[PDB]
Amino acid sequence: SSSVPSQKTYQGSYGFRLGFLHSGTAKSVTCTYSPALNKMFCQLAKTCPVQLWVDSTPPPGTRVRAMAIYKQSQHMTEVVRRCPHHERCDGLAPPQHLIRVEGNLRVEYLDDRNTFRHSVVVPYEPPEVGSDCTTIHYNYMCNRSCMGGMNRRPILTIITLEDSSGNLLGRNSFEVCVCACPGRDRRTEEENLRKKG
Amino acid sequence: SSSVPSQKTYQGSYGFRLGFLHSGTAKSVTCTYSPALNKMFCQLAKTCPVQLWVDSTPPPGTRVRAMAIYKQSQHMTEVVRRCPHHERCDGLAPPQHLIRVEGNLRVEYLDDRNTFRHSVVVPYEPPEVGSDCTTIHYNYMCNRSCMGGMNRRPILTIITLEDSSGNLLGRNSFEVCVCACPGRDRRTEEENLRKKG
DNA sequence: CGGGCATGCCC
DNA sequence: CGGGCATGCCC
Ligand SMILES: *C[C@H]1C(=O)C2CCN1CC2
Ligand SMILES: *C[C@H]1C(=O)C2CCN1CC2
Ligand SMILES: *C[C@H]1C(=O)C2CCN1CC2
Ligand SMILES: *C[C@H]1C(=O)C2CCN1CC2
Ligand SMILES: C[C@@H]1C(=O)C2CCN1CC2
Ligand SMILES: C[C@@H]1C(=O)C2CCN1CC2
Ligand SMILES: [Zn+2]
Ligand SMILES: [Zn+2]
């Protein structure tokens, strides 16, 4: 009955975890992940690699879904959407969707008929031989600050592993801040965490 | 042949001048006019009174037109428009128009067929007996900072007095900055003028 | 109300 | 590149 999807971490029977490349906090970096905050800082429309880790290999036909939700209680029931400006500015991705996947010939974009929430889905592919994870290249097509979209409200990205039958196999999430200067904003929030948290 | 309307002050044979109420520079004022900068600072969608002064009474059927243009040379040829967000948010005023007139049952909104520029027109009415000017209540429906609209670019409002035949009778203009805190921004720009101009 | 931070971006 | 200002708004 809820229109708010779960954000509860569920590693599940396949040991599903997310991973992120080690970047620095240089003021001009295009993205950087804070493990202390479980938070990705990245720039508008630029690659944001997410690693998928599993302890056991999911069955054939497993799918990987990404969806954004507002992190604060007072905004959780509102659907996260592209702002009118960037919407009016790919072909496969409808202009209303915040999250895109690049580099994948099998991407599917969903608008839920009951909850109206947007998600983007790709097939799960096992890591190549010798590699321990699979990487998906996400793109966030608005800044957190965009008026008429996120309007400065923080968001979570929820990644779910789902089998072809629709069984939830795993769930993980991270906060995302799409901003002009990811390195500066990570440094500021981490400093604020240490001194005022 | 030019698609850029004139901004040249032309008092004309009727002695046409603009006037503005004396406001202060309190941080929360809804609008304030700087004579030193010939610049109105005002808030989004709130009243911005403009006084019309004439030395001689224009003929019956005179009209008062307002139009915005970008002040900087590099943007002058681009049409000033409402941003996509506030456009998607009166009835008589088309959503694309930046400048509205409130309180007037005879307002006309024009989209020029050749230049595509927007303007808003009302009849000229002489001042009431004993009064020296006529006031028009303008509304600016975007902030200067709106992405996809003015996008932080400065603008002029050009007020023209025109007879019913379309003869230009007078022209005046002022800079406009639609901002959150008109009193603060006037104080800052005037201080910057005095010390760095 | 006014002080002050967060965030985009400096033509 | 990084320093720093301008501007919206603080839940
Ligand atoms: C944002 C992400 C990238 O695209 C590379 C630079 C920074 N971070 C790790 C690798
Ligand atoms: C963070 C800041 C920089 O360092 C350049 C890229 C992003 N932003 C504007 C210029
Ligand atoms: C903005 C304009 C108004 O509406 C009154 C207050 C400030 N200024 C003069 C009168
Ligand atoms: C300027 C500042 C104020 O003083 C209030 C009105 C406008 N802005 C936000 C709150
Ligand atoms: C997760 C794993 C790694 O650490 C590197 C880059 C991505 N994957 C294969 C090698
Ligand atoms: C221009 C003139 C004034 O100064 C007051 C207010 C508006 N007009 C009539 C009286
Ligand atoms: Zn946007
Ligand atoms: Zn706007």
Residue numbers in the entry:
A (entry chain A), B (entry chain A): 94 to 182, 186 to 293
Question: How do the authors describe this structure?
Answer:
The human p53 tumor suppressor is a 393-residue protein that in response to cellular stress, acts as a transcription factor by binding as a tetramer to a wide range of DNA response elements, activating various events including DNA repair, cell-cycle arrest, senescence or apoptosis. Mutations in the p53 gene were observed in more than half of human cancers. To uncover the structural basis of rescuing p53 mutants by MQ we investigated by X-ray crystallography high-resolution structures of the core domains of mutant and wild-type p53 bound to MQ in the absence and/or the presence of their DNA response elements. These studies reveal diverse binding modes of MQ to specific cysteine residues that stabilize the proteins and their interaction with DNA.
In addition, we present the structures of MQ bound to DNA complexes of the rescued double mutant R273C/S240R, referred as R273C/S240R-DNA-MQ, and two types of MQ-modified wt complexes referred as wt-DNA-MQ (I-III) and wt-DNA-MQ (P1). The MQ-modified complexes of p53-DNA show clearly defined MQ conjugates at three Cys residues: C124, C229 and C277. In the p53-DNA complexes where the two DNA half-sites are contiguous and hence the two dimers are parallel to each other, MQ-C229 conjugates are located at the inter-dimer interface. In the other MQ-modified DNA complexes, the carbonyl oxygen of MQ is oriented away from the DNA and toward the L1 loop.
